Design a protein around this motif. Sequence first.
Motif, PDB file in Angstrom:
ATOM      1  N   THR A  43      -3.739 -30.338   4.116  1.00  0.00           N
ATOM      2  CA  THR A  43      -5.148 -29.965   4.248  1.00  0.00           C
ATOM      3  C   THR A  43      -5.792 -29.770   2.875  1.00  0.00           C
ATOM      4  O   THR A  43      -6.906 -30.238   2.608  1.00  0.00           O
ATOM      5  CB  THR A  43      -5.285 -28.680   5.079  1.00  0.00           C
ATOM      6  OG1 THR A  43      -4.696 -28.863   6.356  1.00  0.00           O
ATOM      7  CG2 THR A  43      -6.741 -28.348   5.322  1.00  0.00           C
ATOM      8  N   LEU A  44      -5.111 -29.051   2.002  1.00  0.00           N
ATOM      9  CA  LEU A  44      -5.632 -28.849   0.662  1.00  0.00           C
ATOM     10  C   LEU A  44      -5.447 -30.092  -0.192  1.00  0.00           C
ATOM     11  O   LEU A  44      -6.320 -30.423  -0.998  1.00  0.00           O
ATOM     12  CB  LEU A  44      -4.933 -27.654   0.017  1.00  0.00           C
ATOM     13  CG  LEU A  44      -4.910 -26.407   0.922  1.00  0.00           C
ATOM     14  CD1 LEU A  44      -4.214 -25.239   0.269  1.00  0.00           C
ATOM     15  CD2 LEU A  44      -6.309 -25.985   1.333  1.00  0.00           C
ATOM     16  N   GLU A  67      -0.481 -27.085   5.887  1.00  0.00           N
ATOM     17  CA  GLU A  67      -1.353 -26.406   4.950  1.00  0.00           C
ATOM     18  C   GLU A  67      -1.460 -27.194   3.654  1.00  0.00           C
ATOM     19  O   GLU A  67      -2.557 -27.379   3.125  1.00  0.00           O
ATOM     20  CB  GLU A  67      -0.821 -24.993   4.720  1.00  0.00           C
ATOM     21  CG  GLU A  67      -1.792 -24.116   3.982  1.00  0.00           C
ATOM     22  CD  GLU A  67      -1.272 -22.680   3.875  1.00  0.00           C
ATOM     23  OE1 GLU A  67      -0.411 -22.291   4.702  1.00  0.00           O
ATOM     24  OE2 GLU A  67      -1.735 -21.959   2.981  1.00  0.00           O
ATOM     25  N   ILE A  89      -3.040 -17.447   9.709  1.00  0.00           N
ATOM     26  CA  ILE A  89      -4.489 -17.398   9.512  1.00  0.00           C
ATOM     27  C   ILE A  89      -5.008 -15.993   9.803  1.00  0.00           C
ATOM     28  O   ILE A  89      -4.492 -15.311  10.688  1.00  0.00           O
ATOM     29  CB  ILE A  89      -5.129 -18.403  10.491  1.00  0.00           C
ATOM     30  CG1 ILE A  89      -4.942 -19.864  10.025  1.00  0.00           C
ATOM     31  CG2 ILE A  89      -6.607 -18.112  10.723  1.00  0.00           C
ATOM     32  CD1 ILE A  89      -5.091 -20.857  11.162  1.00  0.00           C
ATOM     33  N   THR A 126     -13.916 -28.172   6.555  1.00  0.00           N
ATOM     34  CA  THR A 126     -13.594 -29.490   7.143  1.00  0.00           C
ATOM     35  C   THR A 126     -14.596 -29.849   8.229  1.00  0.00           C
ATOM     36  O   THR A 126     -14.960 -31.031   8.357  1.00  0.00           O
ATOM     37  CB  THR A 126     -12.156 -29.593   7.698  1.00  0.00           C
ATOM     38  OG1 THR A 126     -11.998 -28.818   8.901  1.00  0.00           O
ATOM     39  CG2 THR A 126     -11.120 -29.189   6.661  1.00  0.00           C
ATOM     40  N   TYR A 179     -15.627 -21.655  12.047  1.00  0.00           N
ATOM     41  CA  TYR A 179     -14.822 -22.844  12.313  1.00  0.00           C
ATOM     42  C   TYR A 179     -14.602 -23.051  13.807  1.00  0.00           C
ATOM     43  O   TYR A 179     -14.712 -24.169  14.308  1.00  0.00           O
ATOM     44  CB  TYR A 179     -13.492 -22.700  11.581  1.00  0.00           C
ATOM     45  CG  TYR A 179     -12.350 -23.559  12.035  1.00  0.00           C
ATOM     46  CD1 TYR A 179     -12.259 -24.911  11.661  1.00  0.00           C
ATOM     47  CD2 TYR A 179     -11.288 -23.006  12.715  1.00  0.00           C
ATOM     48  CE1 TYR A 179     -11.170 -25.691  12.017  1.00  0.00           C
ATOM     49  CE2 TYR A 179     -10.186 -23.784  13.095  1.00  0.00           C
ATOM     50  CZ  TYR A 179     -10.130 -25.133  12.728  1.00  0.00           C
ATOM     51  OH  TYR A 179      -9.080 -25.934  13.078  1.00  0.00           O
ATOM     52  N   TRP A 231      -7.390 -14.364  11.800  1.00  0.00           N
ATOM     53  CA  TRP A 231      -8.153 -14.740  12.993  1.00  0.00           C
ATOM     54  C   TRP A 231      -9.511 -14.061  13.084  1.00  0.00           C
ATOM     55  O   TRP A 231     -10.390 -14.542  13.822  1.00  0.00           O
ATOM     56  CB  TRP A 231      -7.320 -14.390  14.251  1.00  0.00           C
ATOM     57  CG  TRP A 231      -5.921 -14.874  14.192  1.00  0.00           C
ATOM     58  CD1 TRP A 231      -4.784 -14.126  14.054  1.00  0.00           C
ATOM     59  CD2 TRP A 231      -5.502 -16.227  14.277  1.00  0.00           C
ATOM     60  NE1 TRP A 231      -3.681 -14.939  14.042  1.00  0.00           N
ATOM     61  CE2 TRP A 231      -4.089 -16.238  14.196  1.00  0.00           C
ATOM     62  CE3 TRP A 231      -6.180 -17.437  14.425  1.00  0.00           C
ATOM     63  CZ2 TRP A 231      -3.336 -17.427  14.237  1.00  0.00           C
ATOM     64  CZ3 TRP A 231      -5.423 -18.637  14.466  1.00  0.00           C
ATOM     65  CH2 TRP A 231      -4.019 -18.608  14.383  1.00  0.00           C
ATOM     66  N   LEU A 253     -10.808 -24.318   6.208  1.00  0.00           N
ATOM     67  CA  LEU A 253     -10.795 -24.826   7.587  1.00  0.00           C
ATOM     68  C   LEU A 253     -12.213 -25.072   8.078  1.00  0.00           C
ATOM     69  O   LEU A 253     -12.527 -26.137   8.635  1.00  0.00           O
ATOM     70  CB  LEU A 253     -10.084 -23.854   8.520  1.00  0.00           C
ATOM     71  CG  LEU A 253      -8.648 -23.408   8.228  1.00  0.00           C
ATOM     72  CD1 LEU A 253      -8.152 -22.429   9.336  1.00  0.00           C
ATOM     73  CD2 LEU A 253      -7.716 -24.587   8.172  1.00  0.00           C
ATOM     74  N   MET A 267      -9.195 -34.713   7.179  1.00  0.00           N
ATOM     75  CA  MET A 267      -9.088 -33.325   6.714  1.00  0.00           C
ATOM     76  C   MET A 267      -9.257 -32.362   7.876  1.00  0.00           C
ATOM     77  O   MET A 267      -8.531 -31.354   7.988  1.00  0.00           O
ATOM     78  CB  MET A 267     -10.132 -33.064   5.631  1.00  0.00           C
ATOM     79  CG  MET A 267      -9.823 -33.801   4.389  1.00  0.00           C
ATOM     80  SD  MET A 267     -10.986 -33.593   3.033  1.00  0.00           S
ATOM     81  CE  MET A 267     -12.470 -34.322   3.616  1.00  0.00           C
ATOM     82  N   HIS A 268     -10.191 -32.670   8.775  1.00  0.00           N
ATOM     83  CA  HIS A 268     -10.387 -31.816   9.951  1.00  0.00           C
ATOM     84  C   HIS A 268      -9.171 -31.844  10.879  1.00  0.00           C
ATOM     85  O   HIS A 268      -8.726 -30.789  11.363  1.00  0.00           O
ATOM     86  CB  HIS A 268     -11.658 -32.171  10.718  1.00  0.00           C
ATOM     87  CG  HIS A 268     -11.887 -31.237  11.869  1.00  0.00           C
ATOM     88  ND1 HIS A 268     -12.031 -29.868  11.685  1.00  0.00           N
ATOM     89  CD2 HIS A 268     -11.920 -31.447  13.213  1.00  0.00           C
ATOM     90  CE1 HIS A 268     -12.156 -29.288  12.875  1.00  0.00           C
ATOM     91  NE2 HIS A 268     -12.105 -30.219  13.813  1.00  0.00           N
ATOM     92  N   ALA A 281      -6.642 -29.496   9.379  1.00  0.00           N
ATOM     93  CA  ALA A 281      -7.047 -28.114   9.640  1.00  0.00           C
ATOM     94  C   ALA A 281      -6.607 -27.675  11.032  1.00  0.00           C
ATOM     95  O   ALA A 281      -6.077 -26.561  11.227  1.00  0.00           O
ATOM     96  CB  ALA A 281      -8.558 -27.974   9.497  1.00  0.00           C
ATOM     97  N   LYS A 282      -6.847 -28.520  12.037  1.00  0.00           N
ATOM     98  CA  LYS A 282      -6.392 -28.193  13.384  1.00  0.00           C
ATOM     99  C   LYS A 282      -4.865 -28.119  13.450  1.00  0.00           C
ATOM    100  O   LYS A 282      -4.306 -27.351  14.256  1.00  0.00           O
ATOM    101  CB  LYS A 282      -6.917 -29.222  14.381  1.00  0.00           C
ATOM    102  CG  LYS A 282      -8.447 -29.228  14.497  1.00  0.00           C
ATOM    103  CD  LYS A 282      -8.955 -30.025  15.702  1.00  0.00           C
ATOM    104  CE  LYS A 282      -8.649 -31.457  15.559  1.00  0.00           C
ATOM    105  NZ  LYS A 282      -9.172 -32.180  16.767  1.00  0.00           N
ATOM    106  N   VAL A 316      -2.783 -27.000  11.002  1.00  0.00           N
ATOM    107  CA  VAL A 316      -2.500 -25.665  10.462  1.00  0.00           C
ATOM    108  C   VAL A 316      -2.738 -24.633  11.537  1.00  0.00           C
ATOM    109  O   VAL A 316      -1.941 -23.710  11.741  1.00  0.00           O
ATOM    110  CB  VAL A 316      -3.397 -25.369   9.232  1.00  0.00           C
ATOM    111  CG1 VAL A 316      -3.308 -23.887   8.799  1.00  0.00           C
ATOM    112  CG2 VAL A 316      -3.022 -26.243   8.060  1.00  0.00           C
ATOM    113  N   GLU A 317      -3.887 -24.752  12.200  1.00  0.00           N
ATOM    114  CA  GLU A 317      -4.265 -23.817  13.256  1.00  0.00           C
ATOM    115  C   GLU A 317      -3.246 -23.822  14.393  1.00  0.00           C
ATOM    116  O   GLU A 317      -2.830 -22.760  14.892  1.00  0.00           O
ATOM    117  CB  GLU A 317      -5.652 -24.184  13.787  1.00  0.00           C
ATOM    118  CG  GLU A 317      -6.116 -23.252  14.930  1.00  0.00           C
ATOM    119  CD  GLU A 317      -7.338 -23.726  15.658  1.00  0.00           C
ATOM    120  OE1 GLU A 317      -7.670 -23.076  16.680  1.00  0.00           O
ATOM    121  OE2 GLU A 317      -8.004 -24.705  15.223  1.00  0.00           O
ATOM    122  N   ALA A 333     -10.392 -23.594  -1.915  1.00  0.00           N
ATOM    123  CA  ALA A 333      -8.977 -23.820  -1.681  1.00  0.00           C
ATOM    124  C   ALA A 333      -8.137 -23.255  -2.821  1.00  0.00           C
ATOM    125  O   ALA A 333      -7.105 -22.633  -2.582  1.00  0.00           O
ATOM    126  CB  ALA A 333      -8.707 -25.314  -1.551  1.00  0.00           C
TER     127      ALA A 333
END
Lengths: 274, 274
Positions: free
Chosen positions: B61-62, B58, A2, A84, A12, A4, A81, B87-88, B91-92, B94-95, A72
């Motif tokens: 998420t998409l 990833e 990502i 979401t 986000y 950052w 992100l 979806m959220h 996202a977390k 991926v993070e 996306a």
Amino acid sequence: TIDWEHPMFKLYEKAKRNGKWNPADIDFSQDQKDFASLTSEEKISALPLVAGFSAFEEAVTLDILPMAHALARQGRLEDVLFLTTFMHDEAKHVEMFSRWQQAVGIGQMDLSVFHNDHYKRIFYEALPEAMNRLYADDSPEAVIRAATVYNMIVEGTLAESGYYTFRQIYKKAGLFPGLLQGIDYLNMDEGRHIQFGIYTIQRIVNEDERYYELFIRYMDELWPHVIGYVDYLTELGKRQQQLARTYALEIDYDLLRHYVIKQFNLRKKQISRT
Amino acid sequence: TIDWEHPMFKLYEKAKRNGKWNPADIDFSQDQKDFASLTSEEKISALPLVAGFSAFEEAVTLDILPMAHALARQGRLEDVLFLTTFMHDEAKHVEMFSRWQQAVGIGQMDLSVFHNDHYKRIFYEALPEAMNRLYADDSPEAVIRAATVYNMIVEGTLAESGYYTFRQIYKKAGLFPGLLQGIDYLNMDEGRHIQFGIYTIQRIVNEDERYYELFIRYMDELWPHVIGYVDYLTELGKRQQQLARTYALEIDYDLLRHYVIKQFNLRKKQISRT
Ligand SMILES: CCCCCCCCCCCCCCCC(=O)O
Ligand SMILES: CCCCCCCCCCCCCCCC(=O)O
Ligand SMILES: [Fe+3]
Ligand SMILES: [Fe+3]
Ligand SMILES: [Mn+2]
Ligand SMILES: [Mn+2]
Ligand SMILES: [Mn+3]
Ligand SMILES: [Mn+3]
């Protein structure tokens, strides 16, 4: 990884930090008593504004999906992100108003009667058309128009003015504390939604200052329906003044109106030509 | 209002209650020290599994967006509210993996080298094709196939087995406590994702018991690539055994393999023909 430092990754992160509120935790027991205490004519006074919000919360929950798809597909992972959190916020907004309607006893009641023609031109045409377009046309023009209608007009002008109106009326009255707690949470979330739209429009404008002209034009195309709905709610409010009399509210509809005008022009000024 | 008794509204409520964790709060300082302490050959041992997860987080998420679109278009509002939490969550996810990669110093490193052909048949074809199909074809067949590939195979079989594998290896070793805290959160979220897929497939099967046959068939169509990736990670693990020796891990790849087989068959058994 990502990126950052990306502005939408930072947004986000703020959304996660500031988005813990849960509509299921709001105590609506006093709102139920307040609504029951109202006369039939006082009961109606509040419904047009709840009608305008309830429907749009549902509309943007569904209608933000094409924006997430388009960004996306462009590989804008940080934007996705963040979105979401946007979509989840709007889900909680649908939930909040539906909990209030249920609690005060109007869940079975059909509030579409309070959507006039100008409202419907935004709600049933400009908004879903502009968002859905993104599924087949993600051009800079299409993305600017989508963010203008969604983030700058529906949220940045109408919703923001609706939050103000709610406070100007019922916070004064001491009425509906649960709904007003909800409105405070919605208003906090809405800040991030509007900042998404500003960032999106600005980064497209930055490519080609001529997109600035398109942005201003689309704002002006929609203004007639913004004020036409606002005028129509003003007319309603002036014709049913029992809640204002009962609660000693000199509801200044001229001040609300200038707040709408003010919201519209300040959204314009958050986009720079250069 | 919302249908407050709908199973997906209830799952949405649980997601809000159980989904507060924030990957930004996880302390990865010890993971950085652990990774730095490893020999070059011990360093590689861990990367294939992180590579498989990072990419799929990833991807989903998409790739969950078309499902939200399709169910929204069908007016399944409660499903959509729940999917904003899905979806959220992704996202977390991926993070979380991207934070770990950054913290241990492999963010600049390219992990695609650990995706073999079977992985790519799921990741670059079966999954995105099945999900994207929903934009133009939301038939019961298309919706079953999407939930089968996404929720029952990618999540319900591979991810679940990957969580187990992570614990079977590194929880034993005392290594990477921040990553393992993350894995515990992912695994909790994943329960709701899998329950969405079960509910979706079951309610379609309930209409026409013949859709049960389609579900079993699609599961079997994908099994060859599930086990082919699993075999390929097994081969990798057996060829680089320095981490297992250093940390006294008799890594039982036969037990992992039977866990995958077990995951696959129990997902089948959570769908009833009747
Ligand atoms: C009586 C003075 C007029 C005040 C203006 C009221 C506008 C009513 C609310 C309708 C717009 C709601 C939009 C919500 C969008 C979102 O949730 O992001
Ligand atoms: C060595 C034994 C094999 C164990 C199986 C490992 C599977 C690796 C993980 C890949 C799938 C990840 C899917 C994530 C999907 C989601 O986040 O919903
Ligand atoms: Fe909003
Ligand atoms: Fe998942
Ligand atoms: Mn008019
Ligand atoms: Mn093979
Ligand atoms: Mn909202
Ligand atoms: Mn995940």
